[PDB]
Amino acid sequence: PSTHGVLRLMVTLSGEEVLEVVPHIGYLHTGFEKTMEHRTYLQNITYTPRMDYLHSFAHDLAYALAVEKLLGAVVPPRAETIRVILNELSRLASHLVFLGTGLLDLGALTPFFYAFRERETILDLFEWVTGQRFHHNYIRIGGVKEDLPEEFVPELKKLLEVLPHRIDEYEALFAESPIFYERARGVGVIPPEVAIDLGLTGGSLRASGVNYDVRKAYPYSGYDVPLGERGDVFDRMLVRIREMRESVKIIKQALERLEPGPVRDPNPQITPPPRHLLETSMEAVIYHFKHYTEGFHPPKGEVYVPTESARGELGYYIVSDGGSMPYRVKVRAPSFVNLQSLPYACKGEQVPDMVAIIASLDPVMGDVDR
Amino acid sequence: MRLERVLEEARAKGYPIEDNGLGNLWVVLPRERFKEEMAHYKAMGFNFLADIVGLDYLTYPDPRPERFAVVYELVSLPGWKDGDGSRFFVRVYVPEEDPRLPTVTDNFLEREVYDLFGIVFEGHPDLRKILTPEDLEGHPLRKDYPLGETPTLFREGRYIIPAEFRAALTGKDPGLTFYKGGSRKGYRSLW
Amino acid sequence: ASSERELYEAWVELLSWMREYAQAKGVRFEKEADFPDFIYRMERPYDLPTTIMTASLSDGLGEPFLLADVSPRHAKLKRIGLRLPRAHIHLHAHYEPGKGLVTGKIPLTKERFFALADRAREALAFA
Amino acid sequence: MVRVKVNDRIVEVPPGTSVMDAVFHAGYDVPLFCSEKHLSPIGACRMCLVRIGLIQWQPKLAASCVTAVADGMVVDTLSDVVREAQAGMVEFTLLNHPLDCPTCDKGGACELQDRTVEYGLYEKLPVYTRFEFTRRHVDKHHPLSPFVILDRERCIHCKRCVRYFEEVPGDEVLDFIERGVHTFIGTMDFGLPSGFSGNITDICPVGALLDLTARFRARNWEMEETPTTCALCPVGCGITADTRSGELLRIRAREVPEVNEIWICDAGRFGHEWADQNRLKTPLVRKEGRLVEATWEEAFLALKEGLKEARGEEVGLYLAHDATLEEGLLASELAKALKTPHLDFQGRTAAPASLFPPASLEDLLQADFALVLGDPTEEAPILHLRLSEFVRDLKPPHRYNHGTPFADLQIKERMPRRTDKMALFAPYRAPLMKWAAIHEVHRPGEEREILLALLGDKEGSEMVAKAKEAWEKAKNPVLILGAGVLQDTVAAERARLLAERAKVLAMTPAANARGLEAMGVLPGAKGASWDEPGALYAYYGFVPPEEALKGKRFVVMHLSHLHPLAERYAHVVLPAPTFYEKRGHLVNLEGRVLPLSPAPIENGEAEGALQVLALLAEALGVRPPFRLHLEAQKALKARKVPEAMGRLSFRLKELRPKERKGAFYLRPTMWKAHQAVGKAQEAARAWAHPETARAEALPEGAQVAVETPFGRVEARVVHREDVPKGHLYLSALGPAA
Amino acid sequence: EREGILFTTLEKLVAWGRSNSLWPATFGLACCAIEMMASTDAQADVMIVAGRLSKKMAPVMRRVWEQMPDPKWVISMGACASSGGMFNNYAIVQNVDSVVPVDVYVPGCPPRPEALIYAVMQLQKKVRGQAYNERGERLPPVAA
Amino acid sequence: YPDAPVALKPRFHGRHVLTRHPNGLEKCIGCSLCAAACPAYAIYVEPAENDPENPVSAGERYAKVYEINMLRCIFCGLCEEACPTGAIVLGYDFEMADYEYSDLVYGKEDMLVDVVGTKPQRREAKRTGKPVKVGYVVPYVRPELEGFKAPTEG
Ligand code: SF4
Numbered sequence A: 001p002s003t004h005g006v007l008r009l010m011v012t013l014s015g016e017e018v019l020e021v022v023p024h025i026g027y028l029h030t031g032f033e034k035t036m037e038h039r040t041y042l043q044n045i046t047y048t049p050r051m052d053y054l055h056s057f058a059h060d061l062a063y064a065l066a067v068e069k070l071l072g073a074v075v076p077p078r079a080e081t082i083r084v085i086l087n088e089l090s091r092l093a094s095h096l097v098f099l100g101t102g103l104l105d106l107g108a109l110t111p112f113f114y115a116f117r118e119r120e121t122i123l124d125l126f127e128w129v130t131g132q133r134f135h136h137n138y139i140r141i142g143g144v145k146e147d148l149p150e151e152f153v154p155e156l157k158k159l160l161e162v163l164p165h166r167i168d169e170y171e172a173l174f175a176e177s178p179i180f181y182e183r184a185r186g187v188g189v190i191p192p193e194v195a196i197d198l199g200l201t202g203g204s205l206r207a208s209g210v211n212y213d214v215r216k217a218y219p220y221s222g223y224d225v226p227l228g229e230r231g232d233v234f235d236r237m238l239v240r241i242r243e244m245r246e247s248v249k250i251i252k253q254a255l256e257r258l259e260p261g262p263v264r265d266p267n268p269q270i271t272p273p274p275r276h277l278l279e280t281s282m283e284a285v286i287y288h289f290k291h292y293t294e295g296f297h298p299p300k301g302e303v304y305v306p307t308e309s310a311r312g313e314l315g316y317y318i319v320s321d322g323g324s325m326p327y328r329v330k331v332r333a334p335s336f337v338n339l340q341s342l343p344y345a346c347k348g349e350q351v352p353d354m355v356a357i358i359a360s361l362d363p364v365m366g367d368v369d370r
Numbered sequence B: 001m002r003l004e005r006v007l008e009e010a011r012a013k014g015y016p017i018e019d020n021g022l023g024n025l026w027v028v029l030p031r032e033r034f035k036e037e038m039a040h041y042k043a044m045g046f047n048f049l050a051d052i053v054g055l056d057y058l059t060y061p062d063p064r065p066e067r068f069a070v071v072y073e074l075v076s077l078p079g080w081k082d083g084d085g086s087r088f089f090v091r092v093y094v095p096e097e098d099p100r101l102p103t104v105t106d107n108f109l110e111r112e113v114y115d116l117f118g119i120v121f122e123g124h125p126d127l128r129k130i131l132t133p134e135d136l137e138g139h140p141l142r143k144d145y146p147l148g149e150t151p152t153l154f155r156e157g158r159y160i161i162p163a164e165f166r167a168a169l170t171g172k173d174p175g176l177t178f179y180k181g182g183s184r185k186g187y188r189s190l191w
Numbered sequence C: 001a002s003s004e005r006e007l008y009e010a011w012v013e014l015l016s017w018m019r020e021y022a023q024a025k026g027v028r029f030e031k032e033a034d035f036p037d038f039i040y041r042m043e044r045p046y047d048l049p050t051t052i053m054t055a056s057l058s059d060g061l062g063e064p065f066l067l068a069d070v071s072p073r074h075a076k077l078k079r080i081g082l083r084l085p086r087a088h089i090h091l092h093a094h095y096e097p098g099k100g101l102v103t104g105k106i107p108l109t110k111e112r113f114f115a116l117a118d119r120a121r122e123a124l125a126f127a
Numbered sequence D: 001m002v003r004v005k006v007n008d009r010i011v012e013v014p015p016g017t018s019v020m021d022a023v024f025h026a027g028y029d030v031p032l033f034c035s036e037k038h039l040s041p042i043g044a045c046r047m048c049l050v051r052i053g054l055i056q057w058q059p060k061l062a063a064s065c066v067t068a069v070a071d072g073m074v075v076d077t078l079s080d081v082v083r084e085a086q087a088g089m090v091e092f093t094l095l096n097h098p099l100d101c102p103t104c105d106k107g108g109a110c111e112l113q114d115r116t117v118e119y120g121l122y123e124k125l126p127v128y129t130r131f132e133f134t135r136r137h138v139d140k141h142h143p144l145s146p147f148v149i150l151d152r153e154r155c156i157h158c159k160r161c162v163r164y165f166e167e168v169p170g171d172e173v174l175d176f177i178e179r180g181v182h183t184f185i186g187t188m189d190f191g192l193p194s195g196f197s198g199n200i201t202d203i204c205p206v207g208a209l210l211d212l213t214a215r216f217r218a219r220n221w222e223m224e225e226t227p228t229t230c231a232l233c234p235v236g237c238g239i240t241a242d243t244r245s246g247e248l249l250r251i252r253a254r255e256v257p258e259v260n261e262i263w264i265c266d267a268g269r270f271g272h273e274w275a276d277q278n279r280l281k282t283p284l285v286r287k288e289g290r291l292v293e294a295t296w297e298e299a300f301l302a303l304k305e306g307l308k309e310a311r312g313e314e315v316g317l318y319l320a321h322d323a324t325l326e327e328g329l330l331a332s333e334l335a336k337a338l339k340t341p342h343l344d345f346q347g348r349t350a351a352p353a354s355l356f357p358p359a360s361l362e363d364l365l366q367a368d369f370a371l372v373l374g375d376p377t378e379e380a381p382i383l384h385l386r387l388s389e390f391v392r393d394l395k396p397p398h399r400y401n402h403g404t405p406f407a408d409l410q411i412k413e414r415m416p417r418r419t420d421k422m423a424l425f426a427p428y429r430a431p432l433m434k435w436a437a438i439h440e441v442h443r444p445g446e447e448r449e450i451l452l453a454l455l456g457d458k459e460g461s462e463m464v465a466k467a468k469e470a471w472e473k474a475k476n477p478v479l480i481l482g483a484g485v486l487q488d489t490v491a492a493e494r495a496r497l498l499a500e501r502a503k504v505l506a507m508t509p510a511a512n513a514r515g516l517e518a519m520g521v522l523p524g525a526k527g528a529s530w531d532e533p534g535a536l537y538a539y540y541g542f543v544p545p546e547e548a549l550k551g552k553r554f555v556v557m558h559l560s561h562l563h564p565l566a567e568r569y570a571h572v573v574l575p576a577p578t579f580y581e582k583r584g585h586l587v588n589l590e591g592r593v594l595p596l597s598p599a600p601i602e603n604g605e606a607e608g609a610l611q612v613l614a615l616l617a618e619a620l621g622v623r624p625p626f627r628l629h630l631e632a633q634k635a636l637k638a639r640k641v642p643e644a645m646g647r648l649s650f651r652l653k654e655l656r657p658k659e660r661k662g663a664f665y666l667r668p669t670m671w672k673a674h675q676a677v678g679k680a681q682e683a684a685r686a687w688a689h690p691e692t693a694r695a696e697a698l699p700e701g702a703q704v705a706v707e708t709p710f711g712r713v714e715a716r717v718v719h720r721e722d723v724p725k726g727h728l729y730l731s732a733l734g735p736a737a
Numbered sequence E: 001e002r003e004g005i006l007f008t009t010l011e012k013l014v015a016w017g018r019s020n021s022l023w024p025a026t027f028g029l030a031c032c033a034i035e036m037m038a039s040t041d042a043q044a045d046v047m048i049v050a051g052r053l054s055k056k057m058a059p060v061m062r063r064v065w066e067q068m069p070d071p072k073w074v075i076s077m078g079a080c081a082s083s084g085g086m087f088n089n090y091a092i093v094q095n096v097d098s099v100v101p102v103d104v105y106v107p108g109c110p111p112r113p114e115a116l117i118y119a120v121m122q123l124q125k126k127v128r129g130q131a132y133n134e135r136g137e138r139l140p141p142v143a144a
Numbered sequence F: 001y002p003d004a005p006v007a008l009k010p011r012f013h014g015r016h017v018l019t020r021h022p023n024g025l026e027k028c029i030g031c032s033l034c035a036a037a038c039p040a041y042a043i044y045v046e047p048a049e050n051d052p053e054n055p056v057s058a059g060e061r062y063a064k065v066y067e068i069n070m071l072r073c074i075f076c077g078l079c080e081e082a083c084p085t086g087a088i089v090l091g092y093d094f095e096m097a098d099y100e101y102s103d104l105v106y107g108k109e110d111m112l113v114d115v116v117g118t119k120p121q122r123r124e125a126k127r128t129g130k131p132v133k134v135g136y137v138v139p140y141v142r143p144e145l146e147g148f149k150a151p152t153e154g
């Protein structure tokens, strides 16, 4: 019985109630991993956001980080900040949807009518600073493209003044609600609980293994409370609604330490000369002219860095070969591995429940088929 | 992070250790002693949150042992009990005409082991099923497989074949200026 | 300084001369290059007279026999100069309030210029 | 050999090696700017600086390009001091530049740029430039050659160009003027007289000195590079043809040490104006007493229906001079199967070049003397540049890990030329007569007497004697001849000469001739030759002399353009490709096998000759194993023909004398007639040496008309006949009034 | 007979009709799939392709097209569908029009929802035929 | 809401626009950079020599042919970015879906700032004989796009 879910993926399940589920993906395979092997490290930035396309910024970042370290660039204090405010602002964006699809299958339509408003509100914020609804070409190797507009902070305040509580109302809905058929047998328990199905159920699993708390790699100093719990399909839902909570305390927290200054590493071999002086520039004209035609050349080597648990552990494994284009780029891509859990996840339970069983893993095809 | 230390510790006998300036250190293992050794790494068996990648060194500036190579990433999950964070890679160069490599599916890296056969060559021996998460004919990731691109089209019969239009340079390419590369033969900032 | 303003205002004139003298004597006048200070100007300001920074009076084959050029608005020790190719002769013109455009203490009048352009054209013209 | 430790890498390198080359050999780098392959390394442009020692550190940095290496030497190129140094030099080099990059035609293929971005800025906020003063302003974009070469007198001061001029062609037509921060590039020999002027374009590490033949067309990377061989003459140099969107933008020289060095004559470099433009794209066919387009299907039928009246009755095959090695073979085999034949090249010499054993350019340099009988400068242009090095007692350099050397101390700036190493004999005060002490001007078609004397069987002019006495003293000399190869009477003894000594350089009027001869595309016995009509039903891959179209019944011309003669005497026309867009092999005048690759040029995508021969072969009967390339190769590999870069040995002792008489001499030339377009307009259309006086109603520099068996053409002061491809015969008089 | 005022004014009256009986049957793939959902503020014809048409996906969209009522249309949402996107590769189709005839291409990536609206409007104004548009030519209402 | 204009934020990535200086010159000097930085290879450029008399751009070079294949474009600022003159900037228009493929490649005439609607908008509006009412509005025109006419009411 071959079926097409409701998220561009094929799943074959011989089972009369639930047996072996053979998922066939590759329907959105775009070859990213290879096409990037034919683009500027700068050009690649436009490619990174088209894989998770929800919490894109996670990729943007994770990729920059690899390269930044690779060629020893250093991010300005005020950038690091933007890069989390931005990153976590998107983390919310990703979850606002997971929570969205959780609302319909349930019934709460009045609330759903809000969720996809908070969303549009966040997205509006993006178009404010980056000029694009998404795939914002903002993160730059040295930091970010350009300083954020005067209208970003205030508006972020209007959305940061309501959500504080408007998360509990979403918790006060999936928790204390009578629709308890949420405690499905979907037990992502290869070894344990949900705290990992919250992060990266790769097989062996965990409870508080948040790659951005442990193996802390980028800006982090946040006293940021990770939400990992027990149970299994009821929590997968609850948990992520939980992450939204303090994920905002992060936005607030980091919105505090926002003092003006430089937004990207000035090191000329890594960044273009302020386009302000080409009317004099040594021949920084040369730099500019070169910087955009043939890019910079990171040292021969091989790096990788596990990025924020943006819907799961993530990281780019770039192989520089002293050229203007990466020699090889492998994206970890969480979903693609989280999807291995699914066969078991919904191994022994009623088919009718096998929908939320999957949506509970919050897989994104562009992320898996990449 | 003990575990990690104990790793190299003993493996400091016959195995080479490649370390990069950034916190990404990893160990190479010969062909043979991989199966058992990789298994041995089940010693306090890094929880095995293993992630993996398939590299093809053909068309690389500096020559390496064998054309294809594989990397794995064994890690001791920190939120468990004996999880401290011990993370490190491990690689194994694989023969061009003998693309084999015992699976490690012994929750795991089902997909990975597959992925590679999929895109690159690989072709692990033992394995539940060598499913294919790509499409059909040949192998793509391999550097000698055309990226297969169509010229972008414009009006009056003007077309741009990307291959020839790229300004960027592939580490192996000599550049547009005679035979030369300088502080653009790679570049890492000091400190 | 207001001195800068005048200099350029002068450069425009000096140019006007060169054009006058070229069309008049049947010799070719040519704009050699415009200010990068302007080509790459972008949404930035610019209230300066012309874009022309280096002009010349060339002969039949082209070889120039008189080069005039003023320094860009972003340079220091501003000055407008005259140079006779092939014959080691360089002239630096500064601006002075009242006395006007001088080449030191001696004024650079339309007449003088022409006389200079003339002598120069006379001797250095290949065609 | 010496042992030099560069940095952490040790290397064995010959004794006369340059620290520079040492470095690059070791696999390192240093700002290259004034130095250049094949030019005299000099100190200017203090860039290739380095620190040396023996260990003791030399007090001051050295010019890695003019500094010789020594046993046990240590050359560091990364010391904080060295970089701070390079860094500074660039700063200076850039200090007075103008800021034209986006605007500049040197695109990302600029040396100043790469080195700037390379070693450029040095740091231990960032300061891009500290010079806030008025930059140098001079003359910009004033075209030296109304033809090519447009320079921006706003260059760095390397010497590559003037240096080049005085060293390679030997025609100093550019030098510096005035001095100090004012020195610039001016001239006084306005049209840039010499051939070989183009090369300065390829060498100039910056924006002044640019190829105007292709100014403002596309940016350097945008171009689609297609490397192949120029087939306008026998030397088959090496090139790269930049094309973009089906049109041909410019030509560059491709380095090939063995044959063409890295130079390119101007005719070949700027003579591309034509393929670019006006060309035939659809086969035309004569219907209704006029020519009208058709389809290959049509043309074919109308083709067969013109040969179905007479089958296998002396069919004629005549290929163009630039016919590939395959196209030749095919044409051959087809004439074999077709028992009634007699084929030929667009310029096959009465005396087969396969007579004289192929001599190499490599050899030429190592020869001991050069007896020449035909202005190489027009015959095989590059031979001039080679002799340039010959007269300088220069021997082929040592190859390093990076091929040909950047700083070859072997070459000194302004070296003295030996006039006692060469003897020139040609119908006019030839250019290379300058480096010839033994040099005499004679009369058209009278080269025999000279060689005769040279054999020792007769008397001759003093010089011929000094030449004899010369040729006699020489151990391993080389004979160079090219025009009088069409007067077997002479060529016969030319051979005899060599034998008794000895290799030769045959400057054939037809390129790849040496190759077609190896294919047997010759008439042999009875029959008519390329300019000799008579046969019936023929295939012309080029426009023959009018007298050859007349009389024939059916004629198919496989032209690539539309010559009038075709639209008035031809029955079927078939659009062909230029050598620039053909795939296939070639046989150099030194018997070398040079390749030919296709360029994305826009032709009426109307097939090559491989298809046509094969096609027209259908109308006749059999279908020889030739159709496509990949399969036609086995055909060549069959006859055991060296493949790439290989040298093919194949003698031939047979000659078909057809001696001609007349008052006109088609003087061999560099440029070919079908090049008179665009900027080549005036460098192609047709002075006190041979006797045939002025008083014939021919004024000084007046535009007249002239008719010879090879057609009608206009000229001026025309000493004899300026010409195109494949001809150096004497012919019929006719200056129509 | 065909071009008579009778038959003409009829079909033209019909088309104006079928002009508003258009039933958007979205067939989204990647990122586009999400940005086209913001236009849903309240058999099948007029299928909208919004996303990267993988080659593995290719044959499928086809079968889903063939299985529609002849009077149908195709709108290509954003790059990927329209042109080979920014992905020239073995993985993706260069132009959805290579399988299912396209009537209106929409230049986004992802195009604001509104972009999509104006998009069908053009489809709308075409099915009518009241919209012949470039070289000055009369545009057919269907695709085939 | 196709009757009530869309209010998008300035900085929004829209139809490309080529700007001019007050003097009236095209800022753009035919340097194929923007084209080079394009990741989808959606720009083709042909340069020409400025006619000494009756010039086009400031420098000695101007863009004879400047085309962008709007379908291949991904609307990713990079080009506007790479430009060394500030010529190409990103307009606000977006109502530009069309019919024939090859008619989605905007030319120079289709992009200068003196222009108003989009290829498809001006088109129908040609026979319509009724002006182009653009479906958007911004708080103000970006500094960079100075000279671009639009519903600034914002
Ligand atoms: S010569 Fe080189 S550095 Fe100078 S303007 Fe041209 S490209 Fe730029």
Ligand code: SF4
Binding pocket: D151, D155, D156, D157, D158, D159, D160, D161, D162, D185, D203, D204, D205, D206, D208, D209
């Ligand atoms: S014109 Fe070019 S080659 Fe000649 S000196 Fe100047 S930079 Fe060197």
Ligand code: SF4
Binding pocket: D230, D231, D232, D233, D234, D235, D236, D237, D238, D260, D264, D265, D266, D267, D268, D269, D380, D381, D382
């Ligand atoms: S010498 Fe001969 S082969 Fe070389 S460029 Fe000139 S014509 Fe071509």
Ligand code: SF4
Binding pocket: A050, E030, E031, E032, E033, E050, E051, E052, E077, E078, E079, E080, E081, E085, E108, E109, E110, E111
């Ligand atoms: S066009 Fe853009 S938004 Fe749409 S699927 Fe392609 S990459 Fe994603």
Ligand code: SF4
Binding pocket: F037, F038, F039, F040, F041, F042, F043, F068, F072, F073, F074, F075, F076, F077, F078, F079, F080
């Ligand atoms: S926005 Fe991006 S895709 Fe569009 S033209 Fe510019 S660089 Fe190319």
Ligand code: SF4
Binding pocket: F027, F028, F029, F030, F031, F032, F033, F034, F035, F045, F063, F082, F083, F084, F085, F086, F087, F088
């Ligand atoms: S738009 Fe800008 S980048 Fe593009 S060619 Fe014009 S000046 Fe150059």
Ligand code: FES
Binding pocket: D031, D032, D033, D034, D035, D042, D043, D044, D045, D046, D047, D048, D049, D063, D064, D065, D066
């Ligand atoms: S100093 Fe010029 S290259 Fe050596």
